[PDB]
Ligand binder design. Structure first.
Ligand code: CO
Ligand code: CO
Ligand code: CO
Ligand code: CO
Ligand code: CO
Ligand code: CO
Ligand code: CO
Ligand code: CO
Ligand code: CO
Ligand code: CO
Ligand code: CO
Lengths: 145, 144
């Protein structure tokens, strides 16, 4: 019933678990901000946390509409503390660039397999990822002022 | 054409709404730049660019479904607002109109069992919810 390859289902499945860890990382950034009493930065991390679950569930439902199956993996414990405000956001940017590269790797994999549906599915996330990296760069830019 | 004329017209209308939103955000950049709010202006210019990418998504989807795009005249946007908060409230009010308009196309596309168009729009429903919350977040931070 699967109209994607195993290599593609696997890579999509891996990304879903990365989106889940992303939500968890952002949640853990919330705990740091909130403990430092930066309640607005924390509110942004909790919103980002809920959005990354939106990302993960988008991968979920794509995997299944293409006849695949999802296996959830263990979620590593995220850091719960950073050396200041700028450093936590630098970590967010670092993580978002990591997510971007991983999505790029799936896109090239899907193109070499002539998988049009998965290429087209992924282009939506490339744009969101460009937006999400620029968001952090803007925050970092404004903090060094 | 594998979309109905009703959906095509709805999608072409939204394309022109994205085109206008881009021009609105550019106009807001002219205001922020005039007033020295250079960083705000950069946000507007990036948003103007993004709204154009929204326009070209609808463009390509229409042609991919066998429809045609027709570009309408672009209204002159406001040039000036009464301060930063006023500029961002207008943005928020404009985003809410864009959100409603997309839902109306989603409603119509569902009723016609146009599955491809439902699936296309659900990306925009989610982007719209984020874009609304971004400017709402700005406004809350301005009350400060
Ligand atoms: Co808040
Ligand atoms: Co994500
Ligand atoms: Co992200
Ligand atoms: Co977005
Ligand atoms: Co986002
Ligand atoms: Co910038
Ligand atoms: Co800037
Ligand atoms: Co738009
Ligand atoms: Co918009
Ligand atoms: Co956006
Ligand atoms: Co808020």
């Amino acid at each position: 019933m699967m109209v994607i390859s195993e290599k593609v289902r696997k890579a999509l499945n891996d990304q879903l678990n990365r989106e889940i860890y992303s939500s968890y990382l952002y949640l853990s950034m919330a705990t740091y901000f909130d403990a430092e009493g930066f309640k607005e930065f924390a509110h942004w991390m909790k919103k980002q946390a809920q959005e990354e679950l939106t990302h993960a569930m988008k991968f979920y439902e794509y995997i299944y509409e293409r006849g695949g199956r999802v296996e959830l993996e263990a979620i590593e414990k995220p850091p719960s503390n950073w050396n200041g405000i700028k450093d936590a956001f630098e970590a967010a940017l670092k993580h978002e660039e990591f997510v971007t590269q991983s999505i790029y790797n799936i896109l090239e994999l899907a193109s070499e397999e002539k998988d049009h549906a998965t290429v087209s599915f992924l282009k939506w996330f490339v744009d969101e990822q460009v937006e999400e990296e620029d968001q952090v760069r803007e925050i970092l830019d404004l903090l060094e002022k």
